[PDB]
Paper text:
To examine the mechanism underlying the inhibition by ML175 we solved the crystal structure of GSTO1-1 in complex with ML175. The overall structure of the GSTO1-1 - ML175 complex is essentially the same as the previously published complex with GSH1. Superposing the structures results in a RMSD of 0.36 Å over 237 Cα atoms. ML175 binds in the “H-site” of GSTO1-1 and is covalently attached to catalytic residue Cys32. The chloride atom of ML175 has been displaced by the sulfur atom of C32. Clear electron density was observed for the nitrophenyl moiety, with weaker density observed for the propyltrifluoroacetamide group. The flexible nature of the propyltrifluoroacetamide group may explain this observation. The nitrophenyl moiety is oriented toward the side-chain of Lys57, and sits between Leu56 and Tyr229. The propyltrifluoroacetamide moiety lies in an extended conformation oriented toward the back of the “H-site”, contacting residues Pro33, Val127, Ile131 and Trp222. Binding of ML175 induced rotation of residues Tyr229 and Ile131.
The Omega class GSTs are distinct from the other GST classes because of their active site cysteine residue and their capacity to catalyse several redox reactions that are not catalysed by most other GST isoenzymes. GSTO1-1 catalyses the deglutathionylation of protein thiols and could therefore play a significant role in modulating the glutathionylation of intracellular proteins that participate in specific signaling pathways. Thus, in the models of inflammation that we have investigated, we have consistently observed a phenotype similar to that of TLR4 deficient or MyD88 deficient mice, strongly confirming the view that GSTO1-1 makes a significant contribution to pro-inflammatory signaling via the TLR4 pathway. Overall these studies indicate that GSTO1-1 plays a pro-inflammatory role in the innate immune system and our identification of the mechanism of action of a small molecule inhibitor and demonstration of its capacity to ameliorate LPS mediated inflammatory shock in mice validates GSTO1-1 as a new target and paves the way for the further development of novel anti-inflammatory drugs.
Residue numbers in the entry:
A (entry chain A), B (entry chain A): 3 to 241
The structure:
């Protein structure tokens, strides 16, 4: 378990990524990097994980990503890919297995249009912790409602189990991490006027890849309390 | 020339797109939609243009794009694609001709990483007209400097004529429209500590596709003055 402890300030930069593997620089509670990890798991890609201490970053980490953000992929050839959506798509193209994005140009364009429908949700999750009372919480539940009703329409129009069709695909993995945190953020009743989106959540937790990666509510709260204090230990909560 | 006049509020929705063509809903001074038009021209795609009056939109236009934004593509099958970058990539995949994005997953990922380096520039252009004096203009030239130095690094690292290699490609077309407006916005000296980016601009204006689409500074100022008054005529400046 200790093997997953994060690298921070003072740590030695890492050696090369071995042939036959790809490396992901990540952080165990980071929903942006969960995306890439979902994709790695669904496609069966052999990989290694380096958790980055995002409150106490290694200086050499900016050599990996000048923005200082996880996730970052690094392969045996020494190529560096960052930005979550870009990492996920790189993996879908570069590796064999289940294709998560469709081949059809239009179908693929739809998945991205849907991604765009969702694009306000991550910064609402952010600003969810600018909320300090029952009033700001009310308003916030509303902002989440207006965005979830956009996704509800897509499911209503298509009448498919998942956003990309009847099978799970990239779009679902790209959005899942923020819905995973909804329960523990006390926002699960924002889906009660979106009955298909609510059924989508339940189908997601049944996906073997989702399920293998889900963080318990308990673990997530531990992380959150420490995150909100700029604690250098947040990243390693539980160890 | 009158053929290019915009459709506004009151206009009849359009008929179907004919077979052998794709339609772009656009606006002649919209840099987001210029992207899609650059791509249409570079790939030699037969198409028709409907200019949308963005200060006085047709109601039926929201049926084309629930966000109400140009550009939107509509094909003969009746499929609808919006968001500029998504339109451009759809076109690159769906149509024959010069491939604007590379086949290599990593090379393609780089183009998108560069796109991401540029992603603050469009809203700086926006906020460029929140500038009302020589002080806010000073600060603004600085904000533009910090972003252009990021692109300068990419050119320094690669030592290529264009951002995607020695040939012009998608990334260049995706960023060009905001650099096109820089002169007329009185920001051309923001490139004077980025000598490669400045040489990139000159090479761009030599590209036959760029050149066929460039709006004169004169035409652009006409548009801007009317835009800044919420004039329903802005869109059709010159006719
Ligand atoms: C890694 C990652 O995705 N982020 C985005 C965090 C968005 N907010 C949250 O997840 C919430 F408040 F916890 F709900 C990220 C960026 C930086 C850190 N950090 O510990 O400094 C964590 C997560
Ligand atoms: C169509 C398009 O790209 N936009 C973005 C405008 C960004 N600002 C500018 O170009 C500048 F101020 F002119 F420099 C867009 C959106 C809406 C309209 N409109 O006329 O309402 C025009 C352009």
């Amino acid at each position: 378990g200790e093997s997953a402890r994060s690298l921070g300030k003072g740590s030695a930069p890492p050696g090369p990524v071995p042939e036959g593997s790809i490396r992901i620089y990540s952080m165990r509670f980071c929903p942006f990097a969960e995306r890439t990890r979902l994709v790695l798991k669904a496609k069966g890609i052999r990989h290694e994980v380096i958790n980055i201490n995002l409150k106490n970053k290694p200086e050499w980490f900016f050599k990996k990503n000048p923005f200082g953000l996880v996730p970052v992929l690094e392969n045996s050839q020494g190529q560096l890919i960052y930005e979550s959506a870009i990492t996920c798509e790189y993996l879908d193209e570069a590796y064999p297995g289940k294709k998560l994005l469709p081949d059809d140009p239009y179908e693929k364009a739809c998945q991205k249009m849907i991604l765009e429908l969702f694009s306000k949700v991550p910064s609402l999750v952010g600003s969810f912790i600018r909320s300090q009372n029952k009033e700001d919480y009310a308003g916030l539940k509303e902002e989440f409602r207006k965005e979830f009703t956009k996704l509800e329409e897509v499911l209503t129009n298509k009448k498919t189990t998942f956003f990309g069709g009847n099978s799970i695909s990239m779009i679902d993995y790209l959005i899942w991490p923020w819905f995973e945190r909804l329960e523990a953020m006390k926002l699960n009743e924002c889906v009660d006027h979106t009955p298909k989106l609510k059924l989508w959540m339940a189908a997601m937790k049944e996906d073997p890849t989702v399920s293998a990666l889900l963080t318990s509510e308990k673990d997530w709260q531990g992380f959150l309390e420490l995150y909100l204090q700029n604690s250098p230990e947040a990243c390693d909560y539980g160890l």
